[PDB]
Amino acid sequence: PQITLWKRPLVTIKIGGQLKEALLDTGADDTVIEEMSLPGRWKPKMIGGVGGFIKVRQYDQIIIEIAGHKAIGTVLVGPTPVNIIGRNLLTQIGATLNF
Amino acid sequence: PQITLWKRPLVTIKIGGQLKEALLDTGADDTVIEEMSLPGRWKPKMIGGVGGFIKVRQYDQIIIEIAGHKAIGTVLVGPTPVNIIGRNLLTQIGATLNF
Ligand SMILES: CC(C)CN(C[C@@H](O)[C@H](Cc1ccccc1)NC(=O)O[C@H]1CO[C@H]2OCC[C@H]21)S(=O)(=O)c1ccc2c(c1)OCO2
Numbered sequence: 001p002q003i004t005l006w007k008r009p010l011v012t013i014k015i016g017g018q019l020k021e022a023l024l025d026t027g028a029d030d031t032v033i034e035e036m037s038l039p040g041r042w043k044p045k046m047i048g049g050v051g052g053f054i055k056v057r058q059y060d061q062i063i064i065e066i067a068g069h070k071a072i073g074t075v076l077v078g079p080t081p082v083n084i085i086g087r088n089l090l091t092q093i094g095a096t097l098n099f
Numbered sequence: 100p101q102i103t104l105w106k107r108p109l110v111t112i113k114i115g116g117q118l119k120e121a122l123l124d125t126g127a128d129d130t131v132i133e134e135m136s137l138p139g140r141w142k143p144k145m146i147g148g149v150g151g152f153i154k155v156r157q158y159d160q161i162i163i164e165i166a167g168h169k170a171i172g173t174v175l176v177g178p179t180p181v182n183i184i185g186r187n188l189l190t191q192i193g194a195t196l197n198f
C-alpha cells in the first residue's frame with residue numbers, strides 16, 4: 001500500500017499472540033512495544049528520545065506480523081507511550097519513503 | 100526519491116540560510132530542531148516522546164528546504180536529540196510510506 005501522512009501511520013500488528021496498534025516510524029532505529037510478556041531470554045537496554053531515556057527489555061528473534069506481512073527481529077519492551085515499529089522491522093517488509 | 104530504511108533517513112535541510120542534517124520521521128507529528136535563532140514571535144508548546152515531555156518554542160510559517168523541496172510551516176525549537184522532520188512538513192514535500 002501507499003500510506004499518506006496526513007494522519008499518524010497506524011497499523012495493526014500481531015505479536016506474542018496479541019493484536020495491537022502500532023506506529024510505522026522511520027525515525028525509530030528500533031521497535032518498541034508497551035509492556036507485555038514475550039518468550040525467551042532478554043537483556044536490559046536504555047533507549048533515548050525526546051524527553052530522555054527509558055529502560056526496556058530486549059528480546060531477540062521475535063516474529064511480528066505487520067499489516068499482514070511477517071518479519072522477525074529484535075523487539076524492545078518497556079514504558080513507551082505508543083507502540084513503535086522501527087527501521088529494524090520496516091526494512092523487512094520492504095517499506096520505503098517516497099517523494 | 101525512494102528512500103530505503105537500512106540506514107537512518109537523514110537529509111540536508113536549509114533553514115535561516117544554514118544547512119543542517121535532519122531525520123525524516125513518520126513517527127513525529129511535528130518538526131523539531133535543535134537550538135537556533137528564528138525570526139518572529141514564538142508560542143509555547145509541550146511535546147511528548149519516548150522519555151517524557153519537553154518544552155519547545157513554536158515558530159509558525161518558517162521557510163525550510165528539505166532534501167531540495169520547499170516547505171513553509173511550523174518549526175519547533177528545543178532540546179531534541181536530533182533534528183526531526185515530522186508529518187507537518189513531510190506532507191508538504193509529498194512524502195508517502197510504501198510497502
Ligand atoms: C526522537 C526520535 C529520534 C526517536 N523516537 C522515534 C520518534 O518517531 C518518536 C515516536 C513517538 C511517538 C509518540 C510518543 C512517543 C514517541 N516521535 C516523537 O518523539 O515525536 C515527537 C515530535 O512530534 C510529536 O509527535 C509524536 C511525539 C512528538 S523514539 O520514540 O524516542 C525511539 C524509538 C526507537 C528507538 C529509539 C528512540 O532509540 C532506539 O530505538
Ligand SMILES: [Cl-]
Binds near residue numbers: 072073074088089
Ligand atoms: Cl533486528
Ligand SMILES: [Cl-]
Binds near residue numbers: 094103
Ligand atoms: Cl531493499
Ligand code: NA
Binds near residue numbers: 062
Ligand atoms: Na529470543
